[PDB]
Amino acid sequence: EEQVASIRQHLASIYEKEEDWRNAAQVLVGIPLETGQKQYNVDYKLETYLKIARLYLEDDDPVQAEAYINRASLLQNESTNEQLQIHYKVCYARVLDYRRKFIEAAQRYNELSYKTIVHESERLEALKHALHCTILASAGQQRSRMLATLFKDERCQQLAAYGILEKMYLDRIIRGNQLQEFAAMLMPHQKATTADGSSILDRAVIEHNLLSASKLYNNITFEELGALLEIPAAKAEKIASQMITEGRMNGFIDQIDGIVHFETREALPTWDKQIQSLCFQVNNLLEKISQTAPEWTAQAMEAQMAQ
Amino acid sequence: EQFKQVFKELEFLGWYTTGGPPDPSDIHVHKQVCEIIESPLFLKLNPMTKHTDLPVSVFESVIDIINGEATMLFAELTYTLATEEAERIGVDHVARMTSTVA
């Protein structure tokens, strides 16, 4: 009955208030899901459906929860006042995050970060979640677009992970301490670790550092490529060979002395590029002169053209 | 659909128009363009200019939160003229309009 269930509702909520998620397994059967014959209001059913989602998230069963919220998404579109949309978006983003679908969750959180209904702190939290999910996402151009979009934002400058987004987008070298800080600030479910540990983030950061070091070096020794990536020299050679083989780098490995060669910058095209740069500097300097002193610049121009 | 048949590796980047400084009409049209592509470029050419430089200006959309609503603004970009011997020769021949070592 309605009143009988309601009376136990507040008692169960107060009992759960002790921050006991172990009991969240049994609270699912305490909620009157289908015991009533009558069809309740759409808002009540949707709110119950949404509150079951975060409870099951603590129960670590997202596989069925995905389809469970997908089938309620159809009815979620209607009978929403204002907060149903916000709650549904937050729950969908969280369940996408928990299923290691980091790139889609990043887009969802980025979209959520602009809704004006929620508070500013919620917007910043959504932005932080989007940044973390983008960084943890899989390599590709899709994730690159999201990285550029987050970099163009400014609200991202006050996040703790900006120092790593800046190096991730601009192709810089992430040292050990920055990665350690980022991993420390991460959540346990985001720290995936396929097979023998080999944390996926730790492998992606190594493969990004090796790719970024290809623009600063002309040829690097194994013993100092390993000390730059913080790995043994044999591991550095193996990773370099793997990346050079398939499609991910340009260069070749000489194993006798031990050196991996990146691009060599042939002399004559380099000479042409430097000529281009010197002429570009001439043009920019002339524009600056013409802009910071127009009255003298006009007299100077009309002293050799009409000469 | 038509142009994907001819040029296969070319992709949509943004839109262009003619006028002076960016205008609210332009920032309204940029929303419709951005509905298609995440980061579309904006190009503005001034056909009636008064300076001594090329009137082409390039902008990119940057969104911001202020006063309790989201406003989208334009950030200027610096461009460089691309290099190609065929394009350079054609451009020079078109610009000039009238011994082989002379």
| Strands of the A252-254 sheet, one edge to the other | A219-221, A259-261, A252-254
Angle at A119 (CA atoms; ends A118, A124), nearest 5 degrees: 100
Cα–Cα dist A127/A148, whole Å: 14
Across the interface, whether the CB atoms of B63 and A114 are under 8 A apart is answered yes
- Give every CB contact of residue A114 below 8 A, 6+ residues apart in sequence: A123, B63, B65, B70
- Let me know: does A133 contact A103? Beta carbons within 8 Å: yes
Structure tokens at A271: 């000479």
> What b-and-e string marks burial along B37-58, b requiring 16 or more CB atoms within 10 Å of the CB?
eeebbbbbeeeeeeeeeeeebb
Cα–Cα dist A307/B82, whole Å: 34
- Let me know: does B59 contact B42? Beta carbons within 8 Å: yes
- Residue B65 corresponds to which amino acid? I
Cα–Cα dist A100/B63, whole Å: 28
Distance from CA of A297 to the nearest CA of B (A): 13
Q: Give the relative orientation of helices A267-292 and A294-301 as an angle to the nearest 10 degrees.
A: 110
- Let me know: does A89 contact A118? Beta carbons within 8 Å: no
- From the number of C-beta atoms within 10 Å of its C-beta (0-12, 13-18, 19+), residue A236 rates as buried
Across the interface, whether the CB atoms of B63 and A153 are under 8 A apart is answered yes
Cα–Cα dist A177/A185, whole Å: 12
Say whether residue A116 is in contact with chain B using an 8 A CB cutoff: yes
Say whether residue A114 is in contact with chain B using an 8 A CB cutoff: yes
B63: part of which helix (H) or strand (E)? Answer: strand B56-66
Helix/strand/coil for B84? coil
Q: In B, which residues are within 8 Å of A149 by CB distance?
A: 38-39
Question: DSSP label at A158?
Answer: G
Say whether residue A119 is in contact with chain B using an 8 A CB cutoff: no
Structure tokens at B22: 């960016």
Residues A70, A73, A74, A79: what is their CA dihedral angle, to the nearest 10 degrees?
Answer: 160
- Let me know: does A259 contact A222? Beta carbons within 8 Å: yes
- From the number of C-beta atoms within 10 Å of its C-beta (0-12, 13-18, 19+), residue A67 rates as exposed
Nominal resolution (angstroms): 3.4
From residue A203, how far is each of A139, A182, A229 by CA, in Å? 11, 14, 11
- Let me know: does A96 contact A137? Beta carbons within 8 Å: no
- Let me know: does A88 contact A50? Beta carbons within 8 Å: yes
B72: part of which helix (H) or strand (E)? Answer: strand B69-77
Helix/strand/coil for A36? coil
B73: part of which helix (H) or strand (E)? Answer: strand B69-77
CA-wise closest residue to A279 among B13, B2, B80:
B80
Q: How many CB atoms lie within 10 A of CB B22?
A: 17
* Residue in chain A lying closest to B66 (CA): A116
Structure tokens at A15: 């009992």
Say whether residue B62 is in contact with chain A using an 8 A CB cutoff: yes
Q: In A, which residues are within 8 Å of B38 by CB distance?
A: 145, 149
Q: Give the relative orientation of helices A141-152 and A162-169 as an angle to the nearest 10 degrees.
A: 130
Helix/strand/coil for A271? helix
Q: Are strands A259-261 and B14-18 parallel, antiparallel or unpaired?
A: unpaired
Pinpoint the alpha helices (H) of A99-232: 102-112, 120-136, 141-152, 162-169, 176-185, 200-212, 222-229
Distance of CA B40 to the CA centre of its chain: 10
Helix/strand/coil for A6? helix
With a CB-CB cutoff of 8 Å, which residues 247-286 of chain A face chain B?
280
Say whether residue A189 is in contact with chain B using an 8 A CB cutoff: no
Distance of CA B69 to the CA centre of its chain: 28
Across the interface, whether the CB atoms of A149 and B65 are under 8 A apart is answered no
Cα–Cα dist A35/B2, whole Å: 59
Q: Which residue matches tokens 């943890």?
A: A136
Q: Give the relative orientation of helices A162-169 and A120-136 as an angle to the nearest 10 degrees.
A: 40
Say whether residue A124 is in contact with chain B using an 8 A CB cutoff: no
Q: In B, which residues are within 8 Å of A154 by CB distance?
A: 64
| Beta strand spans in A216-258 (E) | 219-221, 252-254
